[PDB]
Amino acid sequence: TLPDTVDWREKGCVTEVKYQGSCGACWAFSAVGALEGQLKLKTGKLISLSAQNLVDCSNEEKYGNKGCGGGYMTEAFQYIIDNGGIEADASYPYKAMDEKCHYNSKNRAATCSRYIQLPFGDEDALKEAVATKGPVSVGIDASHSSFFFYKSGVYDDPSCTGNVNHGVLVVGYGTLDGKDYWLVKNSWGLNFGDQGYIRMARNNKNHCGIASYCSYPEI
């Protein structure tokens, strides 16, 4: 059996909300988010990891990430595996632009050994992973202004599709006033949503594609 409610912020596994600005770096914020969680769980340290390091260094044929043009959390993880590490944000800060790779192993703040992909569309497996492993990187359809304007309750918009366009982090789940939700960390800054968080419909037919392309890393 799994708990009815999970919120990884309560265990100190989630860093502050980030603001991607003009750069399409959602995928990199989602990926460092998930690794931040694992890093805290395995070493007791909570550190913001460098989204910029992912944006600058994985923009090549082998990965298919496009820096500020978009990218994939799975390929971010693979970059980190191949590269033997990632820097902390403090030593490799976010510039919201494409720059040339300046990774230095002397500033290595985390590693990754493998990542896990969860079954397409499977909200039960997502719930298991979120409950037992940690925060999980996911794609969502964030193409609607109703997403943009969210403030409270549970986001459910019948115009949502599985056409995912945005990488975010699920750091929990629960039921609010009768409605199951996924607790999602966005990278549109603190003023988006509820201090940078949105509760999105859970067990509603893979709503907004939230369980379509889910992954998490192992340190």
Element (H, E) at 137: strand 136-140
Among 92-100, 165-173, 176-184, 195-203, the segment contacting ligand OFH (CB under 6 A): 165-173
Catalytic (active site) residue 101: no
Cα–Cα distances in Å, from 64 out to 13, 30, 71, 79, 112?
Answer: 29, 17, 7, 11, 19
Task: Show me where the chain is broken: residue before each gap, C-N > 2.5 A.
Answer: none
* Residue in 13, 23, 26, 208 annotated catalytic: 26
Catalytic (active site) residue 207: no
For residue 18, state whether it binds ligand OFH (rule: CB under 6 A).
Answer: no
- Smallest CA-to-CA distance from 209 within 171, 174, 172, 167 is with 167
Among 54-62, 66-74, 97-105, 178-186, the segment contacting ligand OFH (CB under 6 A): 66-74
Among 11-19, 70-78, 153-161, 199-207, the segment contacting ligand OFH (CB under 6 A): 70-78
For residue 24, state whether it binds ligand OFH (rule: CB under 6 A).
Answer: yes
Cα–Cα distances in Å, from 86 out to 52, 141, 181?
Answer: 10, 28, 32
For residue 95, state whether it binds ligand OFH (rule: CB under 6 A).
Answer: no
Residues making contact with ligand OFH (CB under 6 A): 20, 24-27, 66, 69-73, 139, 164-167, 213
